[PDB]
Description:
The structure is a homodimer.
Chain A: E1 3-8, E2 14-16, E3 26-36, E4 42-46, H1 48-56, E5 67-69, H2 97-101, E6 108-116
Amino acid sequence: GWSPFKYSKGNTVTFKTPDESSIAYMRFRNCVFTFTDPKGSLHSIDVTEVLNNMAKGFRDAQNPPSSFTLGGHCQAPLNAFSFVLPGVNDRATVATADEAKKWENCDATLTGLQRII
Amino acid sequence: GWSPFKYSKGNTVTFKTPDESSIAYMRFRNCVFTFTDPKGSLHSIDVTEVLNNMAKGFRDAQNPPSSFTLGCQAPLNAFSFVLPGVNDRATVATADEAKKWENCDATLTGLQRII
Lengths: 117, 115
């Protein structure tokens, strides 16, 4: 059965199987990343397949993990840049660490449903 | 005020000012790119700022055109805009997989105006 989840700005976003079985069988539906920009406007994007692809990336793991964490190598907390919306928060549109500094107090949320098959 | 537009699969997508003025003053609102994948599932993306950014690319021009065309030019198709994780080049990375998208539907709707 599907289980909704909700993360907010600053969360370390870790997705875990309920019984420590393999993360590669974790599936997602209706996942929406929402954020504000420095002018205060809202942006949203469906990131369901990004998340499904992340779980499927563990298919070949010999020692299969029971979780995966969004940050990357530094478990980067959820912020306006956690998922790319082309034209808004991509590094062509925000091409500097200084330019990205303006987005430091913008809100961000991640909601969706997960399950294991 | 804002004017609606709508483009369908295989249309040549050209945005044109109505008075032959510079296209760098065209702006967009509520632009959504929708497409189907080879399995039949529907996908959508907000492409409002992608389109604003194309128009903005003409701000510095000495002799700006009165139009720009999504593009030589490629008619609207499932790859006309990128939805990360679905139709990007890391996800559809081989020629046999790309071929499966050839018949997929694609639609572009939004509002436009001169500012």
